[PDB]
Amino acid sequence: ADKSMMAAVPEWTITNLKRVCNAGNTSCTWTFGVDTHLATATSCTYVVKANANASQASGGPVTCGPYTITSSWSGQFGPNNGFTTFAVTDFSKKLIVWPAYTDVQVQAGKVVSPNQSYAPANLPLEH
Amino acid sequence: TPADKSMMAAVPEWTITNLKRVCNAGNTSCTWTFGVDTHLATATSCTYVVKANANASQASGGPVTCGPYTITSSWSGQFGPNNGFTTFAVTDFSKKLIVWPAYTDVQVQAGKVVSPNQSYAPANLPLEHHH
């Protein structure tokens, strides 16, 4: 038997996503909004620090409004295809999305356009 | 350029089949076994081993290749240990598609197959095959 874990709600849009890292790459500040389209959007500032290579570091958990956010960077496909995945969880709703951005997309410190939308999945936590 | 873009690919959901975690007695190795069934093709069977000096069940794994897939995993206790959960990242590099199956420790701790099989909608990952 098969069960779809995808929620029957609109995709969540990650708005105006950008990554700004300091000169030494020991701190990267990600800013974005989370717009579920069914409620007021949430604005987030998400800072990842490291002794070296903050852009490769795993971040969080960070709270932003109803969300708990982490991130993980992967160079599994080589540096040219490095990418960061966020895990954005609304614990109250038991919903999770995983926005994922290549370094190519965010390296210039400009906002990613278009905004990217993701379908939430159910996470069967026990409250 | 449009304002917004759905990243969800126009393909059937990938079903993770017969998922099981078995860790050794000292929790220095956990073997996850599961299939990736995209339905568009016959399923791929995978054996995914995560090793650690301690607490392999909490350790990040991969990358491991299984058929066309590259797989990593990360465990999170952000909601407390009773709500620990493992998230996989399963990417088909050639198709530029990725899913993130996620299982709570409660679901897998018995070492028994998770049922029902859980399916996930793939997202597009805009990797550059042409640098």
Does B8 fall in a domain? no
Exposure on the CB side of residue B13, measured as CA atoms within 13 A: 18
Which whole-number Å values give the CA distances from A11 to A36, A37, A56, A105, B45, in the listed order? 7, 8, 27, 21, 30
B81 in a structural domain? yes
- Tell me the C-alpha to C-alpha distance, in Å, between residue B78 and each of A48, A68, A125, B74: 16, 8, 12, 12
Distances (CA, A) of B69 to A22, A23, A69, B52: 34, 35, 26, 23
Would B9 be classed as within a structural domain?
no
Q: How far apart are CA B56 and CA B47, in angstroms?
A: 15
Tell me the DSSP string of B48-66.
EEEE-SS-GGGS-EEEEEE
Tokens of B35: 């299939």
The beta-carbon neighbor of A105 closest among B82, B116, B126 is B126
In this structure, how many other beta carbons lie within 10 angstroms of the beta carbon of residue A78? 9
Report the candidate in A17, A15, A60 with the shortest Cα–Cα distance to residue A41. Answer: A15
Cis before A114? omega within 30:
yes
Instruction: Kindly report the number of other CB atoms within 10 A of residue A11's CB atom.
Output: 20
Would you call A127 helix, strand, or coil by DSSP?
Answer: coil
The structure tokens listed for A21 are: 């890292």
Q: Is B130 a domain residue?
A: no
Structural contact between residues B76 and B85, judged by C-beta atoms closer than 8 angstroms = yes
In a domain, B6, yes or no: no
Q: Which tokens belong to A20?
A: 């700004």
Residues of A in contact with B126 (CB under 8 A): 102, 104-105
Q: How far apart are CA A26 and CA A44, in angstroms?
A: 20
Supply B9's token pair.
Answer: 């690919």
Residue type, B84: G
| Angstrom distance (rounded) from CA A98 to CA A80 | 21
Amino acid, single-letter form, for residue A59: G
Are B119 and A91 inside 8 Å of each other by CB? no
CA separation for the pair A74, A83 (Å, rounded) = 6
Answer whether residue B1 is part of any domain.
no
Q: Is residue B84 part of a domain?
A: yes
CA atoms within 13 A on the CB side of A48: 24
Task: Please give the Cα distance from B21 to B58 (Å, whole number).
Answer: 12
CA distance A22 to chain B (A): 25
- Is B4:B108 a contact under the CB 8 Å cutoff? no
Q: Which residues of A38-54 are buried (b: 16+ CB within 10 A; e: fewer)?
A: eeeebebebebeeeeeb
Task: Show the beta-strand stretches assigned E in chain B.
Answer: 4-6, 14-23, 29-37, 44-51, 61-66, 69-76, 85-92, 97-99, 102-104, 117-120, 123-124
Dig out the tokens for A110 from the structure: 């400009």
Gap from B38 CA to chain A (nearest CA, Å): 12
Distance from C-alpha of A28 to C-alpha of A57, rounded to nearest angstrom: 9
Interchain pair A74, B87: CB under 8 A: no
User: Is residue A122, in this structure, part of any structural domain at all?
Assistant: no
Helix ranges restricted to H, A26-127 = 103-106
Domain count, chain A: 1
Q: Give the resolution to one decimal, in Å.
A: 1.6
Number of CB atoms found within 10 A of residue B40's CB: 9
Domain that residue A44 falls in? 12-107
A59 has which bridge partners?
A71
What is the rounded distance in angstroms from the CA atom of residue B18 to the CA atom of residue B95?
Answer: 24
Distance in angstroms (rounded) separating the CA atoms of residues A35 and A40: 7
Where in chain A does DSSP place strands (E)?
Answer: 2-4, 12-21, 27-35, 42-49, 59-64, 67-74, 83-90, 95-97, 100-102, 115-118, 121-122
